[model samples]
Target: MASTFTSDTLPADHKAAIRQMKHALRAQLGDVQQIFNQLSDDIATRVAEINALKAQGDAVWPVLSYADIKAGHVTAEQREQIKRRGCAVIKGHFPREQALGWDQSMLDYLDRNRFDEVYRPEIYPIYWSQAQMQARQSEEMANAQSFLNRLWTFESDGKQWFNPDVSVIYPDRIRRRPPGTTSKGLGAHTDSGALERWLLPAYQRVFANVFNGNLAQYDPWHAAHRTEVEEYTVDKCSVFRTFQGWTALSDMLPGQGLLHVVPIPEAMAYVLLRPLLDDVPEDELCGVAPGRVLPVSEQWHPLLIEALTSIPKLEAGDSVWWHCDVIHSVAPVENQQGWGNVMYIPAAPMCEKNLAYAHKVKAALEKGASPGDFPREDYETNWEGRFTLADLNIHGKRALGMD
Candidate 1:
């Protein structure tokens, strides 16, 4: 359910459930027409500005330096730029030589374990590699993730929603696709959760202001209900990731397998109101399937599609961060440049859910087994050179709750 998309083959009864969901959504909140009007107006205005920004090409996607962030020299306007754009490339987040060296080491590790032969080839699923472990728990990565986490604001009330100061590592897959590789480059979509955002009770509270037609008060930064989300099925993120990101391991030009994103952070307003429109067929849930991601297209999210901007050139060690809700994709064309490689890392802060997941991860790390969310493939168990507790530094230990 996570990545399956057979667009034409409509589900038999899920459409009915969607209709019911929509009816319930409207019934719970009064004057949905008024909300639609406000939402439409906001979308129209934002789409115009975003298109204008994209017209300038790469300038719209903010690019920053790790030195500035770590030295506390990042200006207010720079912070504001990152806030509005919702995505960025933090150049030199790790030294280029260090990152390239890690890439070589990663190749060696994979070769040593014969992961390609034993596991899913092309897209390696081995998550417990030493390179990934060290990178996730590195001092630089922890700080970078922490800085990104603090950019998000939350009204926690009395609930212990999150601690932005502490960054946790949610281990994910790696990418090392070469030129001429042919696969469905991911389409424009948002992660974190799908229908659950509007389905679950706590999730409904997360989008409370949106449902109330007060789109202005809908703060994507408010992280309270984020950790409370529960999608028992094969959908939604297993952990609350404030910003889903990747650290580059090679130089990737525009036409290669590179990331593209809609720069507006609050475009979820449009996403919320799109399906409620009269044009959307009654049987369809805005062409969405539960568990699979909420995808955006020219038909549904035309304005957002028009504003898509590919990232600027990136080298090994450069990293990209995008808000979890930001629409993103990739185009894996062959002629652009060398290999496109990265480690999928996210800014998951210390929270009830993340801490709970962290402990699970620690056990997996110790056993060299697959993490909870992934398949139960023992690709790394009994493999040599895997990272153990002895390999983790203080920051690494603290990040994984090994303290």
Candidate 2:
């Protein structure tokens, strides 16, 4: 009764699920083409706004400083910009020196454990380094995440979706791309799900407005049923994450493999409605496969691709975040300048969904095992310098549901 699909792990009922969803959506939203036309028009306006900012050389991403967030100086104007853009960059989320030190510690931990000898250079499978753990449990990181979490309408429809003040510890891997490397960075895609969004009962309710022919009422930032949507079973996230984020460990300018996002949250409505058009086959969801990230292609989402704006220049200790449904990619860089390093962290708040995952994270943290969301690499189980139970601070304890 509870099977999910992924790129490599398709449930037996995959085709049936797709067929059923198509029929249901067609039945409910008879004029899907008309709905899609309206959505495309709305998305076109957003795309134009983004391109206008780009032409003016204005930062498309809402850039806020950690100091301002802590001091309660984040303005209402800034909040509106963040909501409209669906992404933000927190300048100086950690001290430059401390972030640099952690970067060094990360390298040392990897070297001592001989991680490089067994791993690919792109994304290190290693987790549980003291640097990563310290960052996750840091007060500054908590404050940044809390601010981002509160951006979402956490309570709606007589239910509190999650506790915005406290983020559950969701462990993820690291990305360290060295200088002078020529790489075809990752493609534009949305994580959390592909087919699941259309097939899952919870996701149906989450995007009910779009599918139920009430496109005017659709709100991407609304937290009503987001926490209840479960991703397909793969080495992907299980807990509900309001925003996916990363903290930079080295200063990175644009064109050096920095991140780029669509900057329009409501574009998701376009993604959902695009597939239902008469042109696309009933069985196909653009290029979406069961277990992979939902791809945004020039073929189907040319408007979105046109709006793939890069993050403004980022410094070491700066953190970047985007709404979970936003389309994001890593721009390709040849002979990249400076180091590109970051720890994958996200704003996963405390809720029944996140708390259940946090309990599993605590067990993994204790045993030096991989968190349930990722592969069971268990690379740090016997590695020296792995962060342990004794290192858990009050924040760490509470994040892992230790309280």
Candidate 3:
């Protein structure tokens, strides 16, 4: 089953919002397409560099230092570039030894829990473990939070635009398949509540600049709408905790079960806006250049073509951060000797809206019920081991909206 919500199941207000948002989004398609073209050219140049490096069989782990980040040693221009691109690799964000140890701790926890099923099985273990708590509180993770915080301007109105929190993706595990096993490629999709983006005023603001036909003016960091908009129609909202991320458990290089991303921010903005436009025939849409153009329609923005060239294959410990609106997925694993495993963690910023949701999630956790945007499970009590408030650290607690 696909890991997302469909639009037909939305409330009336949400439906109306989506309709208006779609209309607004469609009006800007031409401009969005133009921005996509520009992003495509840039990515092509970067990919050439990546490919050249890959061809040498020499792995390069790009590192950014704390001093560089804190003192703005890396130019403001570069930071702006990262914001515009929607994703970046911050190497050595965490101590290598600590990150590796966290990986081992997860392995031990999985073993302690006796989790056997693998290959995308719905119910597994290690989603909310003690090790995850430690990693979430690490200096590197905090640095990531600071990095994202600096990216945008925060508004005092109700929305917590810069709020960063830790989210635990449950039971997802590593896959180390032998040659004969069929390769399971993750389909592309965006996170956060689906139609809710339109219904919620704050959420909609994140894409407002694009919908207004100013694709180039879209700011990933401006939090003008995050708090003011509140109605997240129970069914379509995809707001998983903040910062959707994964901690690498093994030394897997590119092509070895790495995470892939579409690196251009504006292109992502454009692609997301496409879904709100008028429906185009699938064939007609498919005819566009796979590397640059995205299909925009009333029903769906099939991310087929853009995903082709925009995918950034990553390495272990090399975190790829993108806008919550960007489309992404896990690439297939090529290594047979080791399982490509990662602990799912997202960046959740503190704010009134998010804090409210965190309270609800906490209540659900206490009752052994599924948390927001997480897959519903049967009988949390029967699920053997589960995570509790005690499992979280101080920083994790803060992210969860706890005092």
Clashes of each: 0, 4, 19
Q: List, residue by residue over 1-403, the lDDT tens digit for candidate 2.
A: 1222222234567776676667768777999988888788888998888888888998889999999998989999999999999999999999888888998998899899888776512777777999999999999989988889888888887889889989999888888888887788889999888887887777777888988879889888899878877777743677888899999998877788878999999988889888877788767889988778899989998989999989888888999999999999988888998888888899998989888998888899889998887777888898999999899999999999886
lDDT of 1: 0.77
RMSD each, Å: 4.7, 2.8, 7.2
Could you estimate the TM-score for every candidate? 0.90, 0.94, 0.68
lDDT (Cα, tens digit) per residue for candidate 1, span 1-403: 1112112122345566567767766665566767777776776776677667666653677888999988978888888888887887899999999999988998899899886677611657677778888999887887788788878775466765788878776878888877666555789988876666555566667777886677888887788777777654642356888898999988877666678988877887778767876787876657677658888898888877877778888889999999978989886564445778888888888888888888988888889888888878868888998888789888777778776
User: In candidate 3, what are the lDDT values of residues 1-403, reduced to their tens digit?
Assistant: 0112123334444334444444445554555556555545644664554456556853322334545664557777667666655666566555566666766765576666555542131224234555655666565676676676556666547644544434322223333333332346565555554444543445545666655666557665566665444434442333433345565554544454445555444445545544443454422322222123122322343333333322234344645566655556655543333445455555656665666777776676566565555566523433444566666666656655667
Off by over 4 Å in 2: 1-11, 116-121
Point out the higher-scoring one by lDDT: 2 or 3: 2
* Residue 10, model 2: Cα distance from true site in angstroms: 6.4
Among the numbered candidates, top lDDT falls to 2
lDDT at 99 for candidate 2? 83
Q: How far is candidate 1 from the true structure (C-alpha RMSD, Å)?
A: 4.7
